């Protein structure tokens, strides 16, 4: 089993939205996926109570629930973490028990604020157990200007970033209002990128079977 | 002097971006405005390191600096607080020393969550000194289905809103990327709404003069 986290202390960074669409993409691909919501506002959970999700949904009451994930959701294939929008211990907890960390950042200047936070807790964790990491462009708008102003930031940090990005589309939102994900609609602009982005994640753990 | 505060724990609600453009609009009308940055990341403060700013910037080292406002920023016609994008003591501190509390919310549903925790901090202050409250729709988009959901999310709380929602435009972003408000742009679609939204904000203070 492998743990995966979507940590980024900032609020409009599309953590929750990503987790859903990406997780679905993985479950409908065969695997057994279990997701842990760590939001004190339980947005993902409030979402799961309506349309049936393709993955299993859980809910954490404290970091006590995160530290024991390798124990509870062990029968599953992947454990995803919708990190809290706060600058809490959850970010600290998550990394402690993860085989992969995804850092969702959006094309904006006020968004790269605490995104740098996660990066240091991973380097700080690198001492006890090397934890992989990848940035994730989200709500990618069409602005070469801003894209570089971020792209550069995503470089100095010293970590990779998925070749694919999550674009901004009224479907990614409209889909959460109803209760579906993005694969429960005909829009093929998103249904594709999510599927490609997901294929990357699978390759990452492919190189752990190689070495 | 009077204090306006923009609070909402949710980080995609555009609390920082709103202030910059409204306070900038507030200075152009002859008012002397000062804004306090409470975000531990100090955004409204880093942005203003670009010189261009029609208002005064004061950073917050803690809530102890948000409390003693009228003792310091008493000379300004206005004092505005960039909310903290985190559930914290900040929200509690602000409402306690405000005359108006604006609450940014976006169309996306799950972005209204914390709109609650705030509305219940005001309900508390009513016991000592009722603080005026209004909901500010920001990043609006023409999504009827989605806006009726947000239109209702407000109604329940039983607080008035603003007939002038801040729309979602690229100018509200590029302008900040250089270090300017939206009043430093040819774009007149944005300058409009804000100039009318700001007007509203002042009307709340006229009824009582």
């Amino acid at each position: 089993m492998k743990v995966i986290s979507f940590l980024n202390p900032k609020g409009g960074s599309g953590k929750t939205t990503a987790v859903i669409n990406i997780a679905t993409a993985l479950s409908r691909s065969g695997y057994n996926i279990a997701v842990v919501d760590t939001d004190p506002q339980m947005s993902l959970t409030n979402w799961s109570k309506a349309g049936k999700a393709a993955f299993d949904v859980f809910t954490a009451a404290s970091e006590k629930d995160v530290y024991g994930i390798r124990k509870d959701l062990a029968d599953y294939d992947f454990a995803i973490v919708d990190g809290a929008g706060s600058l809490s211990v959850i970010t600290s907890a998550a990394v402690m028990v993860s085989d992969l960390v995804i850092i969702p950042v959006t094309p904006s200047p006020l968004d790269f604020s605490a995104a740098g936070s996660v990066v240091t807790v991973l380097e700080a964790q690198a001492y006890s157990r090397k934890v992989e990491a990848r940035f994730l462009i989200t709500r990618k708008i069409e602005m070469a200007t801003m894209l570089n102003v971020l792209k550069e930031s995503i470089k100095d940090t010293g970590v990779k970033a998925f070749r694919t990005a999550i674009t901004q589309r009224q479907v990614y939102v409209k889909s959460i209002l109803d209760g579906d994900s993005v694969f429960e609609s005909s829009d093929g602009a998103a249904k594709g990128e999510i599927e490609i982005l997901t294929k990357e994640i699978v390759r990452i753990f492919e190189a752990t079977h190689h070495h | 002097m009077k204090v306006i505060s923009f609070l909402n724990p949710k980080g995609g609600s555009g609390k920082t971006t709103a202030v910059i453009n409204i306070a900038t609009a507030l200075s152009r009308s002859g008012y002397n405005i000062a804004v306090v940055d409470t975000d531990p990341q100090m955004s409204l403060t880093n942005w203003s390191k670009a010189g261009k700013a029609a208002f005064d910037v004061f950073t917050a080292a803690s809530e102890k600096d948000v409390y003693g406002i009228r003792k310091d920023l008493a000379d300004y016609d206005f004092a505005i607080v960039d909310g903290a994008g985190s559930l914290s003591v900040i929200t509690s501190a602000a409402v306690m020393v405000s005359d108006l509390v604006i609450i940014p919310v976006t169309p996306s549903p799950l972005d209204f969550s914390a709109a609650g925790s705030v509305v219940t901090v005001l309900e508390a202050q009513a016991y000592s000194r009722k603080v005026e409250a209004r909901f500010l729709i920001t990043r609006k988009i023409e999504m009827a289905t989605m806006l009726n959901v947000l239109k209702e999310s407000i109604k329940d709380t039983g607080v008035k809103a603003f007939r002038t929602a801040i729309t979602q435009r690229q100018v509200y972003v590029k302008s900040i990327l250089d270090g300017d408000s939206v009043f430093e742009s040819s774009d007149g679609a944005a300058k409009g709404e804000i100039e009318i939204l700001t007007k509203e904000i002042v009307r709340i203070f006229e009824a009582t003069h």
Binding site: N46, A50, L177, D178, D180, S185 | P109
Partner: peptide
């Protein structure tokens, strides 16, 4: 595209 479009607004209102 269907299913739960109101149940969220309905509750975002309750919160």
């Amino acid at each position: 595209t269907s299913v739960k479009k109101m149940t969220f607004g309905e509750n975002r209102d309750l919160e």
